[PDB]
Amino acid sequence: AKTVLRQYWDIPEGTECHRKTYATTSIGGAAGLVVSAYSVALKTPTSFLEGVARTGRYTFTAAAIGAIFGLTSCISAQVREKPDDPLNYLIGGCAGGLILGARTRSYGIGAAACAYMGLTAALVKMGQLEGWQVFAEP
Amino acid sequence: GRATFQFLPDEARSLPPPKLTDPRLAFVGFLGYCSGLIDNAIRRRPVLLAGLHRQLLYITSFVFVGYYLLKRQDYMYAVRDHDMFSYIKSHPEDFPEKDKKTYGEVFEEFHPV
Amino acid sequence: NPIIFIIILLTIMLGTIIVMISSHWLLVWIGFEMNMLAIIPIMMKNHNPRATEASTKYFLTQSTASMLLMMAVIINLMFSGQWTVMKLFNPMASMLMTMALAMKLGMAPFHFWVPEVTQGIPLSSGLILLTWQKLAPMSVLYQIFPSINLNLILTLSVLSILIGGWGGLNQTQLRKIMAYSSIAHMGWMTAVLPYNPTMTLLNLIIYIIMTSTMFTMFMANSTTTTLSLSHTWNKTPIMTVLILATLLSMGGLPPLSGFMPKWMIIQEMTKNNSIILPTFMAITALLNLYFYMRLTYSTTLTMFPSTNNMKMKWQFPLMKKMTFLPTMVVLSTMMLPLTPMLSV
Amino acid sequence: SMVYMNIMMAFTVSLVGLLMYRSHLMSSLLCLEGMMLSLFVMAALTILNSHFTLASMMPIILLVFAACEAALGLSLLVMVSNTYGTDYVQNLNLLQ
Amino acid sequence: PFFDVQKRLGVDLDRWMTIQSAEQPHKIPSRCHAFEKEWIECAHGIGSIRAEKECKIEFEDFRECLLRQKTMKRLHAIRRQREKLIKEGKYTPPPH
Amino acid sequence: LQYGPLAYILGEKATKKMTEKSKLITVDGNICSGKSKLAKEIAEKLGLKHFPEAGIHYVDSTTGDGKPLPVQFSGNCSLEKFYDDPKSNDGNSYRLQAWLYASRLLQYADALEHLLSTGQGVVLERSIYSDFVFLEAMYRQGFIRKQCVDHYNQVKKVTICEYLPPHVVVYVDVPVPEVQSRIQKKGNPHEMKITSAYLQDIENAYKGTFLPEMSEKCEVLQYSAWEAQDAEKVVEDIEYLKYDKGPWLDQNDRNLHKLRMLVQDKLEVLNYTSIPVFLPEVTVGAHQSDQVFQEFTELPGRKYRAGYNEDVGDKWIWL
Amino acid sequence: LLDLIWLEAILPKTISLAQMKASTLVTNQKGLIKLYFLSFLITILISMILFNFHE
Amino acid sequence: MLKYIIPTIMLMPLTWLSKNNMIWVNSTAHSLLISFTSLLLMNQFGDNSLNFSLLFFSDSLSTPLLILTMWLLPLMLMASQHHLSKENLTRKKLFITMLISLQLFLIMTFTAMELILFYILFEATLVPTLIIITRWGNQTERLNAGLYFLFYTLAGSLPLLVALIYIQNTVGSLNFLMLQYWVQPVHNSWSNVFMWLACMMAFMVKMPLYGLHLWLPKAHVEAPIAGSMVLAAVLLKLGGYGMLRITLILNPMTDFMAYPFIMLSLWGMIMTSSICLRQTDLKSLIAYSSVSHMALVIVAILIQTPWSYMGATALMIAHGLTSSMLFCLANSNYERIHSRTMILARGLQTLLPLMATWWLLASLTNLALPPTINLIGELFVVMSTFSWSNITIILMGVNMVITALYSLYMLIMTQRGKYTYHINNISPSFTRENALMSLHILPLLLLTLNPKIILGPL
């Protein structure tokens, strides 16, 4: 829920590089279940132990992304100059995206997984850096 | 905002009314003047100056209705500002009086190229 | 048959008045109960075995979408016992309310209510009557409005145009192309409803006009996009110019008046320091235009009128109230300084 | 009390996997008429101890539509078997 | 949109059967009739957006008149106040 | 024949004119056998408005006044040009059959239009069902292809849905192929030498193809001889009039039947046969090509503006 | 070799990107009235667990 | 404009109202008469400023730019009649009316009094251009090019509305450019990047950078009857000038991130003209000349501080007249040889002697021969960006080198002979072919006498 972000955005802020990537693989790990549930429902019946959706590798993929997605940041947060920055957290975009690039082979997916993920990476921490609010009221 | 479910209430008497030769009322029905020409053009007329009795009563329609429509448009802005200025008039703590300061107070940036 | 066809047709709009004229949750239950009773004959008229296997896919989707509503009433019957149509006093009720009613208006979840019905009903004639069922629950969300969770009503609406957009680029059947972009134009209005719930009705009155005038143009012969080729040089070349004008108007281009809603609706969506919310949707309805371009690339460029068949006779259908539709659905953008002070 | 939890557990006779599936569609229309009496009772327990004196005409009117509703739905389920002889919800022709 | 025809021309289409204290055909009130009339007295000319955070006292007891939530908890905990001391005396009261 | 909803709720048109005088009758015949020697002769006594068979100029024979415009605008395969039966051509010999079918269908769509309007019987020359008999010897003579045969075979299940069948359908007295002398002695310079493969095959195709409608509930009155000539004239006049009401219908199939109560057999055929532009409305051609039934986009797509002078002849102002 | 390739590679990728995902949403909506309603139930439960929706 | 729009709408119920083939002479007659009235009240004085009437005009005071917009409807009708005269009169009446309908919105544009009146008129075009692109072209690749002309212009222009409505309720109201006396500055932030960037990027999509020029040799290559909207589409490109109205004020102090727009458009300038010397389609040869020395203004606007606005204004209507005529040189000499392949048109300069001067005095304006309106424009840009950094004379000097070898390569391909073929190509460049090729250089070298009329504020 929102309190996961209230333990993500609150305590670490670059340092403590194990609990950063322990919590940031929970969210991205959880969304592998959501893409699994429609891939057994909107797609027809799979093998004997549903969910066995067609190609598999769904929750195998999603939790692996959030496993490194703190780890690429929290290493590179402290080792350079010790803030958290938009250029700091940019680094977790590309190689964080390249998990989907590593599997289901590249040269047409992987660099495109690298490029666009780096666009949407830095804007998130940029969001609270300017105080951006998506779902607001007057 | 009271006196519910009227097309336009009783209290719209002291509004001007929006008298004619205003360009909207010329324009309302000018599109109807265009619409009656379309009304021939759909049906392989093949005139484009067809029966005037079909080409009239479009002009009569939009102008009458559009006039009777605009009497509440000018009402609704008139009732809009009427309630704002009252809430401006009460509660002066939400509406302070700013100080008048000329250009002897400000030291702005200063950024030249 | 002729007189009883009116009495069925008359009570459809009598079902939806009681939805609006009500201070009591029991009467709004009856209101669009009998609409789900009095649509089922109109589905039938020529008795074809797709139509019977389409209304039954229509039916039980609007039986459950009925049935969860009465569940939502009896929960806040227990809490404070007032039955006026107002805020629902319980977050377990309002959550069950809004995503029950999201099936009758169908949003992006509760998906295939919209294409699977409207496709292949042999009554393509109208089926303009699917504008009342978009009009009854919107008259219910005007009152319930100050009791929602503000995340669910946007998440059904952010998904609305992102999946009503993609769904129809893979189509030919122009009833589905009208069935699609009918979820999209339900995406723009309920993204706004928490913020100033009028300037929602502006989008709806525009949506009734531009969609009703689309079906009346279609009632010469038109079934498929390939059939939309073979009437420029055969039926009337003025029809090809007209069918261009409304589509380019319904895409939202600023020389016409389908740009009238958005232009005004972003005046409300920002002014509430919400900027990343409209910039997503405003760039999303752009590939809602690649339906319409690539549809206009069929009829307006003389694309192969073959199979020589002459219509040497005139046309006598009833194009009722057609002469005044593309004169308020195109040319009104200058003439509306305040349409949102009549409707307000 | 516990007289409301049972029965609010018994409102889950919708359960949507068994509200249109699987075949013999009469099994699905069954729980559509059986979803009533989880609304007819859950209303009747609340109007009756708390003496409203007037809203108890509403459980009488709650049956009158849902009977006429389901009777209409049962008319069409003959028409799917009038053309076939078997209802069999894995009949699908008009795609989406 | 809420047209409200029945406020213009004075028929009551419904209205009577809406709240817990309206008419009572032979004047038999409910169990919480005293708090309905008291709570509706609070928010009448108030526009209900300040009523959620100002009144807040005449509504909460009325919610607790109807379900008896903490009254049943103050009663249930007396079964754990005593009644482990069944064998440690204090029958209290002796019959009758 | 109904005129909108408003007239239809005052006076209906199902049965107050058809007082058993429906009697929708056709003939089948063969070439030079049942043309007008027997067909046109019987209009009176029974009051039957005769309709002609076919021709390129049937659409020119309506909408006016009325003189037939030439074969340039109605570009068909030209009666007495296709008698060269061009087995290898551009062509096309199939493009006749499209306009042959649409000039056929408008007679039968005016047939039912005329009956409920008035109440008169109508003899036809050859109905919509006769068009497949030609295709048997159009096939085995090499001047047609497949993937054109299937096309109108797909139109036949599309365009024929509401058509109540004819009643005492006459296979005319037809010889034992004496038409080889009939096609010669009666003139016909362009109807020429083409041998028994077109003669015998259509004659074999009157029996085994037309049999299900001949075995449909409307009883037939069949002859096979030289001619009627006061032997089958009165015998198909009197004893067919006894077969108009008494020995007339079995499953009854055509009556403007039991939905004649302002219901689906009373208006919904007599409102869908009025204004005959919705009758050839599914007469739209192929998916794209069909390689015979085509017209190019702008040449001859520019043969339309020549046939569009003012696009409607006369209507003036003030009306 | 550049002006018609690596400016034309990145943006008309987006034409071939959306139409790759405009096919996964009609050809997986292939009827299956049994499988509409098994997927309504996943949507109705995931609103309970996820977020703000009960709060 | 008091009433310039009001007579030029009255041109529209004159065309269909007319007779038969008189429809060409009736339209071109009255359309020339506005050119007196266009000059008439305008060009007044002049020292801060001419607010004109109301909320509909600031009179296009310091940037005239609008007299050139009114030549063209009596310049294109004499050009379009070459291969149009085979269609119906009912469509020949159409193609004149939408062309006037394109001039209507351009007249309330360039003046526009506001910034939100600008946008709705900035986007009020692109509907009558697209009708001239899709219908009335030649063989295919019209239809994808009809879609590349959209979706760059329209994808960029929608984040204007997010930012222009954002200003209208932040600081007063934008409705006047003369209520822009109170302007708060725009500092360095992470939200004020995007306010600058979204407000700027929708202008880059029309006057192209080196990136995102991918639609410009699509609409101009496959193009109507005789350059008929191609003359309009070159004005419309330079009719995205409004960066001069915006960026002078309204975030004035962001040069911090000008550099990815400088280097992209200053190195792209030296390459995108170099990438054209191997063209084989003649109308695509000119189409890249229009990329290069249009993109010199993009490094002339972002670099502020005039002696550049002296030149950046003079360059907008430098090739307004030059690149128009070059398209007219190629809309002619295609009516006779039916290919636009530059190989095929050889054996020339003997057959058509009178138009040899029309080739040269076109191509002598890119060499630009300093007393013209051209090297009074570049030599203010050169002396401006010298004072940015001295090193910029190198790239801009090699810009002057390659376009010298580029313009003559189109001339010298006609100075050959023996013609090998061509029983056709007889028509000795008739009276119309020289008339619409004139009225280009006749104002172009005339204004070089007193070009104080062509200057900004400045």
Curated annotation (Swiss-Prot), chain A:
Cell location: Mitochondrion inner membrane
UniProt-listed InterPro entries: NDUFA11 (IPR039205)
A biological-process GO annotation: mitochondrial electron transport, NADH to ubiquinone
Signal peptide from the UniProt entry: none
Modified residues (N-acetylalanine): 1
TM annotation in the entry: 21-42, 57-79
Membrane topology, from the record: Multi-pass membrane protein
Keywords attached to this entry: Acetylation, Electron transport, Membrane, Mitochondrion, Mitochondrion inner membrane, Respiratory chain, Transmembrane, Transmembrane helix, Transport
GO (cellular component) term, any one: mitochondrial inner membrane
Function: Accessory subunit of the mitochondrial membrane respiratory chain NADH dehydrogenase (Complex I), that is believed not to be involved in catalysis. Complex I functions in the transfer of electrons from NADH to the respiratory chain. The immediate electron acceptor for the enzyme is believed to be ubiquinone.
Family of this protein: Belongs to the complex I NDUFA11 subunit family.
Subunit structure: Complex I is composed of 45 different subunits.
Full protein name: NADH dehydrogenase [ubiquinone] 1 alpha subcomplex subunit 11
Gene: NDUFA11
Curated annotation (Swiss-Prot), chain B:
Entry-linked InterPro entries: NDUC2
Name this polypeptide is given: NADH dehydrogenase [ubiquinone] 1 subunit C2
Post-translational modification: There is a minor unacetylated form of subunit B14.5b.
GO cellular component, one term: mitochondrion
Keyword Transmembrane helix belongs to the record: yes
Main location: mitochondrion
Subunit structure of this chain's protein: Complex I is composed of 45 different subunits. Interacts with TMEM242.
Location of the protein in the cell: Mitochondrion inner membrane
From Swiss-Prot, chain G:
Entry's transmembrane regions: 31-51
Signal peptide per UniProt: none
Localization terms from the record: Mitochondrion inner membrane
UniProt subunit comment: Core subunit of respiratory chain NADH dehydrogenase (Complex I) which is composed of 45 different subunits.
Function description: Core subunit of the mitochondrial membrane respiratory chain NADH dehydrogenase (Complex I) which catalyzes electron transfer from NADH through the respiratory chain, using ubiquinone as an electron acceptor. Essential for the catalytic activity and assembly of complex I.
Protein family membership: Belongs to the complex I subunit 5 family.
UniProt protein name: NADH-ubiquinone oxidoreductase chain 5
Species of origin: Bos taurus
Gene that encodes the chain: MT-ND5
Swiss-Prot record, chain H:
Membrane topology, from the record: Multi-pass membrane protein
GO molecular function, one term: ubiquinone binding
Main location: mitochondrion
Protein origin, superkingdom: Eukaryota
GO cellular component, one term: mitochondrial inner membrane
InterPro entries per the UniProt record, alphabetical: NADH4_N, NADH_Q_OxRdtase_chainM/4, NADH_UbQ_OxRdtase, ND/Mrp_TM
Protein keywords: Electron transport, Formylation, Membrane, Mitochondrion, Mitochondrion inner membrane, NAD, Respiratory chain, Translocase, Transmembrane, Transmembrane helix, Transport, Ubiquinone
Pfam families referenced in this protein's UniProt entry, alphabetically: Oxidored_q5_N (PF01059), Proton_antipo_M (PF00361)
Catalyses which reaction(s): a ubiquinone + NADH + 5 H(+)(in) = a ubiquinol + NAD(+) + 4 H(+)(out)
E.C. numbers: 7.1.1.2
Sequence intervals crossing the membrane: 22-42, 60-80, 94-112, 116-138, 147-167, 196-216, 224-244, 256-276, 284-303, 308-330, 351-371, 393-413, 435-455
Modified-residue entries (N-formylmethionine), positions: 1
Compartments it resides in: Mitochondrion inner membrane
GO BP annotations, alphabetical order: aerobic respiration; electron transport coupled proton transport; mitochondrial electron transport, NADH to ubiquinone; mitochondrial respiratory chain complex I assembly
Function per UniProt: Core subunit of the mitochondrial membrane respiratory chain NADH dehydrogenase (Complex I) which catalyzes electron transfer from NADH through the respiratory chain, using ubiquinone as an electron acceptor. Essential for the catalytic activity and assembly of complex I.
Family under the similarity heading: Belongs to the complex I subunit 4 family.
Oligomer status and interactors: Core subunit of respiratory chain NADH dehydrogenase (Complex I) which is composed of 45 different subunits.
Protein name: NADH-ubiquinone oxidoreductase chain 4
Organism annotation: Bos taurus
